[PDB]
Amino acid sequence: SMSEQSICQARAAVMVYDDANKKWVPAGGSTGFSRVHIYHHTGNNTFRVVGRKIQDHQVVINCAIPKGLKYNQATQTFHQWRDARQVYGLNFGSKEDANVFASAMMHALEVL
């Protein structure tokens, strides 16, 4: 697993969209900020997003990034993308967190 490396980290609250109730809900069950990484698995050139809550280290997101993922910068601090299972949203702690993480994601998408 040393062949999988973090290429970015940022501070964001991770939500998922509850399709049935038409509302954003905190990923993992409780609202708060996480440390969110983009990991590059160099053996098979894959990427995933993994986030853990700062206070308790709960894993709140573990989401593939496949080739062609559409990454939407909805606002300067809220970005989102789809998975068959749910839409994910990142409410970043700052604009720099958001831009840096995006530029990282755009890089990932270009090397996939």
Give the pair of three-digit tokens for residue 48.
């995933």
* Measured distance CA(57)–CA(39) in Å, rounded: 17
* Measured distance CA(5)–CA(30) in Å, rounded: 27
Give the pair of three-digit tokens for residue 46.
């894959």
Q: Is residue 94 within 8 Å of residue 77, measured between CB atoms?
A: yes
Q: What angle do CA 50, 56, 61 make, to 5 degrees?
A: 20
- What's the burial of 13, exposed, middle or buried (CB within 10 Å: 0-12/13-18/19+)? buried
Q: Is residue 98 within 8 Å of residue 10, measured between CB atoms?
A: yes
Q: Is residue 67 within 8 Å of residue 60, measured between CB atoms?
A: no
Question: Which experimental approach was used here?
Answer: X-ray
**Who contacts 55 (Cβ-Cβ below 8 Å, separation ≥6)?**
32
